[PDB]
Amino acid sequence: MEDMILTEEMQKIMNLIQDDENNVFVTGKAGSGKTTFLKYLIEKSGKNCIVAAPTGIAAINAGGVTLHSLFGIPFGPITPYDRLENKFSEYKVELLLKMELLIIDEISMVRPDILDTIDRKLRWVYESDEPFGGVQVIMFGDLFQLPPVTKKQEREILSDFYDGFFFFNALVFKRTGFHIVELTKIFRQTEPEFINVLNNIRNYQVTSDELDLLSELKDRKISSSYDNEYIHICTHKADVEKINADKLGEQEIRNYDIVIKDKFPESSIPCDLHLKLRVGARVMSLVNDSLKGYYNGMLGIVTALEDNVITVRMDNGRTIKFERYTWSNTQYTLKDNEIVKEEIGSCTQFPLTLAWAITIHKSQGLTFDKIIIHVSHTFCPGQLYVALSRCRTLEGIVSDAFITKQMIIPEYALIDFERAYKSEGNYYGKR
Numbered sequence: 001m002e003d004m005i006l007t008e009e010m011q012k013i014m015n016l017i018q019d020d021e022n023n024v025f026v027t028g029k030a031g032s033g034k035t036t037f038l039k040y041l042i043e044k045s046g047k048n049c050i051v052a053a054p055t056g057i058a059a060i061n062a063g064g065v066t067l068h069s070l071f072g073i074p075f076g077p078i079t080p081y082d083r084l085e086n087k088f089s090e091y092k093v094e095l096l097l098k099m100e101l102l103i104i105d106e107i108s109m110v111r112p113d114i115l116d117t118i119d120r121k122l123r124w125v126y127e128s129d130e131p132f133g134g135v136q137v138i139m140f141g142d143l144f145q146l147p148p149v150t151k152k153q154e155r156e157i158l159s160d161f162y163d164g165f166f167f168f169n170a171l172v173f174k175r176t177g178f179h180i181v182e183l184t185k186i187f188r189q190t191e192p193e194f195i196n197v198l199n200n201i202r203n204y205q206v207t208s209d210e211l212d213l214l215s216e217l218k219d220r221k222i223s224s225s226y227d228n229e230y231i232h233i234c235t236h237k238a239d240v241e242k243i244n245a246d247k248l249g250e251q252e253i254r255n256y257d258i259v260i261k262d263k264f265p266e267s268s269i270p271c272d273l274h275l276k277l278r279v280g281a282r283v284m285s286l287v288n289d290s291l292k293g294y295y296n297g298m299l300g301i302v303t304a305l306e307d308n309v310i311t312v313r314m315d316n317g318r319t320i321k322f323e324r325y326t327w328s329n330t331q332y333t334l335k336d337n338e339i340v341k342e343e344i345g346s347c348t349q350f351p352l353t354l355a356w357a358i359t360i361h362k363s364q365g366l367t368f369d370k371i372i373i374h375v376s377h378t379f380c381p382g383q384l385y386v387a388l389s390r391c392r393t394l395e396g397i398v399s400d401a402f403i404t405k406q407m408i409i410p411e412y413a414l415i416d417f418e419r420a421y422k423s424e425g426n427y428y429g430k431r
């Protein structure tokens, strides 16, 4: 990227990371430039960086590696007194010993014990008492997107040792801490009234006027149809697959298989395994290409299907000839005494997926012009905030049922964290 804007908030982060004793939590809503600024921070860093993330898909998109493979972490809850098989290769040890700056993306998807397992592993390899073995730690993510639901079993094992199931509850943050910088510029568009409604909801300050706006979002006619430009945002996987497949149909179906090359983790695959399409299918772009003119999350309609090209007319009116795309699975090594990346696998497939409907989970980090919210009549803190936040404006939202005050379920663990650091020098943990 070459026309990137350097905001005062981004420079504040760069100012902070100069002092290599400073850890930093970089946060902000979808569209506030976290992924782009991450890349900038990489390039403009005089330090051997490693980028890691808690899922393969997020690792791949950030150009990094999973936390579990980087540090050899067993899958499952781990107390501070569960003993680790600290078996690392001589190369992994040498690599970790050259890491000066660890960057964790999607920090809010990191279950807290994993940070502590990481702190322990680094202390063992550095033979030090300093948290994370003295390595500087930068963390990127939206504080207000919930992590994976805690499985009934992890719940029981871990509650004896932790106060909460958010990343800042890691025990290491009694021994170290971090500055917080929220990115507040939304580059795609700037919408005060909508942004203020989202914030009022997440802070449980909804005014009676705002409660009335939510009521007017209901529209049975629009929300029960599938031929408009609205995308159905639903919580459950089954509902989205039902809607997408129902609309796809069985007549004149074209199939495109994923091509795997060398070593690629199944759960890191960010595309369809068997992309099935037809002329007129509603689809979403999965990757960004500024020169070709599409971005991750752009919606369009298939108009032509050939062997190696899928022609799509996007919502903005442009026709685009999509070709297959190759995601690279990389890992870090040492070239001399410098950390570099090396490809160990790839997968190849058209970067499009059916998009009459998308899950709340698959749409993490995306915004759309027009959404139909399916009210999750269950409950759980923060659901309605997440669903509303999938839109770019207030006027673009439609609901399948009336939105009532009781559907606003606040997450007080998060409100307390925000208000506590905002009044403690934008810093959390030990000084």
Ligand SMILES: Nc1ncnc2c1ncn2[C@@H]1O[C@H](COP(=O)(O)OP(=O)(O)O)[C@@H](O)[C@H]1O
Residues within 6 Å of the ligand: 003, 004, 005, 006, 028, 029, 030, 031, 032, 033, 034, 035, 036, 037, 187, 188, 295, 365
């Ligand atoms: N520094 C920047 N200057 C100009 N545009 C930006 C900048 N950062 C992000 N954008 C724009 O915002 C959109 C995506 O932002 P992104 O980096 O994905 O933010 P996030 O990860 O917070 O969702 C793109 O349209 C991109 O061009």
Ligand SMILES: [Ca+2]
Residues within 6 Å of the ligand: 034, 035, 365
């Ligand atoms: Ca992002």
Ligand SMILES: [Ca+2]
Residues within 6 Å of the ligand: 020, 021, 134, 135, 136
């Ligand atoms: Ca240090």
